[PDB]
Design a binder for this molecule. Structure first.
Ligand code: SAM
Ligand code: SAM
Lengths: 265, 267
C-alpha cells in the first residue's frame, strides 16, 4: 500500500483518542463541516486542531484560514473518521456570554420564552446573526449549555458569533428593565402590525413564545405592546423561527445601522 | 364513543394494513389532534378517528367529528401500543381517504403566488414551508427534487401539522415546472444572494409570480436560472451568511402577502 505517511492510521494515536475523549464527554467541543468551522474561526473561537478524512480535498479557503491562524491540520484515514463529517475541528468552548454582553453590543434583543426545539433554536441563532441582532436570550429552553452539539449543528456554527445567553424568565425581564430596553411581544392579535416595527428608532427586545404556549405572563406584563404578523386567517400560526425572520427583517435597517456603526468603532 | 376494548375488528387490521403495501396508496393515517382537525376542515374524507382509552379526546375534535358524520372510537391502550411499532406513539389518530393528488393546473387556477422549492429535501423544512405558504396566502407549492414519492408521505404529513392538504402541493420535475410556469404566463424569480433585486421590492409587482428557493447544498439550478426574470436577495450583514430556507420563504411571502391576501379575499 505505501499509504501516505501523513495520514493518521492507528485508532489509538493520542489525537484519535483525544477525539474520542470529547465525544465520550477539558472545556472543548467538536465542530463539524467546512462552513461552520469557518464561521467559528472567524468569530474567534480557538481551535486545537482541524482534521479531514483521507481521500477528500480540504477546502482551500479553510486551509488558507488554518495557516492564516496558526491552526494545525491533519488527515485521518477515512475508515476511522467513521467515529462520527469529512472535516471537523476540536475547539475550546468560549466562556458563556452573559446578558451584559448583549446590552453593550447595541441593537435589538431576541428573547425566546420556552422555545425548546433545538432545530428552531439553531435556525433562530443564525437568522439573528445574519439580520443584525445584538443577541439572544434563551428562557426555558431546557438547554444546559449553548455549546450543546445539537445546537452547534443546528446553528451551523453561528452559536458563538453573537452573545446567546441562558437566563431565567425573571432575570431576563429584570435585565431589560434596568437597561431601559422596551420589549414588545409577538403574538396573533397584537396591536402593532409587524410592518410598523422599523418606525421605532431605539433598540428593542422582541419576545417570542413556543408553538403551544406563547410567551408567559411575566413578559406580557412588562411589554410596551404586542406585535402581530398578518396571516390569512386569525387562527393560523407560523413556526417560531419563521416569525423571528419576519420580525427581524422589519427591524433590519435599524439593526444594520447599529452593526455598521459598531464596525467603525 | 364506543371502545375497541380489545381483539381485532376489521378496523384494527386496516390500521395495520395501511403501511407501505398497495392500499396505503389510497388511504393513510393522520396523527394528533390539531393535524386531524386541519385535515377535516380541509375536506379530507375520514373513515374513522381513534383515541387511546386513557388520555381523553379533545371536545372540539369530538364535536367536529360529530358535525361531520365521522365515527369516533377508542382503542384499548394495549392495542394502540404495538401497532405504532419501530417508532413513536400517537394517542389520537384517524384513518382517511387520500385526496386525489393536486396538479400544477390547480395552483394556476387558485391565483396568487407560487412557491417553488428546488432541491429542498429535509421534510421538516418542507413541512414548515407548507404551513408558512398557506398562512401567508400562497396559491400553492411546487416541489422539485424533493425526494418524496407522494405529498401524502407520512413524514410530510406530520412535519406539515396536517396542512399538506390545505392548499395544492405538487411534486414535479424541473423542466415540467419551468414549462408550466412559461405557458401560464407566471414569471419566475429566484431567491439567492447577490441578486439584481431586493426582497423589499417584491411588493411592487401587482401580478402574481413564482418564487424559487434553493436548498442548503447550493441554491437553485441552471434551468431555473435560464427561465428567471430576476434574482431576489434578502439583505444580510455579509454575503458569507445565509438563512434557513423556511425562514427565507417566510420573509419573501411576507413581502408578497398584501398582494396574495387580496387574491385570497377576492375570488
Ligand atoms: C403559535 S406558536 C406555533 C409555531 C410553530 N408550531 C413552531 O414550531 O414554532 C408560534 C410562536 O411564534 C410567534 N408567532 C407565530 N405566529 C405569529 C404571528 N402571526 N404574529 C406574531 N407572532 C407569531 C409567537 O410568539 C408564538 O409563540
Ligand atoms: C443557504 S440555502 C439553505 C440554508 C439552510 N442550510 C437551510 O436549512 O435551508 C437558502 C436558500 O434559501 C434562499 N435564501 C436563503 N438566504 C437568502 C438570502 N439572504 N437572500 C435571498 N434568498 C435567500 C435561497 O433560495 C437559498 O438557495
Amino acid at each position: 500500500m505505501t499509504e501516505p505517511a501523513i495520514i493518521t492510521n492507528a485508532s489509538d494515536p493520542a489525537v484519535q483518542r483525544i477525539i474520542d475523549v470529547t465525544k465520550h464527554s477539558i472545556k472543548t467541543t467538536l465542530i463539524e463541516d467546512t462552513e461552520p468551522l469557518m464561521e467559528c474561526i472567524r468569530a474567534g473561537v480557538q481551535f486545537i486542531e482541524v482534521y479531514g478524512s483521507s481521500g477528500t480535498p480540504l477546502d482551500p479557503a479553510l486551509l488558507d484560514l488554518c495557516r492564516q491562524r496558526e491552526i494545525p491540520v491533519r488527515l485521518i484515514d477515512v475508515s476511522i473518521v467513521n467515529q462520527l463529517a469529512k472535516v471537523f475541528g476540536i475547539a475550546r468552548v468560549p466562556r458563556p456570554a452573559r446578558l451584559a454582553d448583549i446590552a453593550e453590543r447595541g441593537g435589538d434583543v431576541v428573547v425566546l420564552d420556552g422555545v425548546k426545539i433545538v432545530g428552531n433554536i439553531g435556525a433562530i441563532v443564525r437568522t439573528s446573526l445574519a439580520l443584525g441582532a445584538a443577541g439572544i436570550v434563551l428562557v426555558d429552553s431546557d438547554l444546559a449549555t449553548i455549546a450543546d452539539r445539537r445546537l452547534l449543528r443546528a446553528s451551523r456554527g453561528y452559536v458563538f458569533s453573537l452573545p446567546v445567553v441562558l437566563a431565567d424568565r425573571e432575570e431576563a425581564v429584570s435585565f431589560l428593565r434596568d437597561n431601559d430596553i422596551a420589549l414588545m411581544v409577538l403574538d396573533t392579535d397584537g396591536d402593532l402590525g409587524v410592518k410598523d416595527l422599523g418606525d421605532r428608532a431605539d433598540r428593542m427586545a422582541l419576545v417570542f413564545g413556543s408553538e403551544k404556549g406563547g410567551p408567559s405572563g411575566l413578559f406580557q406584563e412588562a411589554s410596551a405592546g404586542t406585535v402581530s404578523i398578518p396571516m390569512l386567517s386569525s387562527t393560523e400560526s407560523l413556526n417560531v423561527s419563521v416569525s423571528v425572520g419576519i420580525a427581524l427583517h422589519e427591524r433590519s435597517a435599524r439593526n444594520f445601522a447599529v452593526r455598521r456603526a459598531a464596525a467603525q468603532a
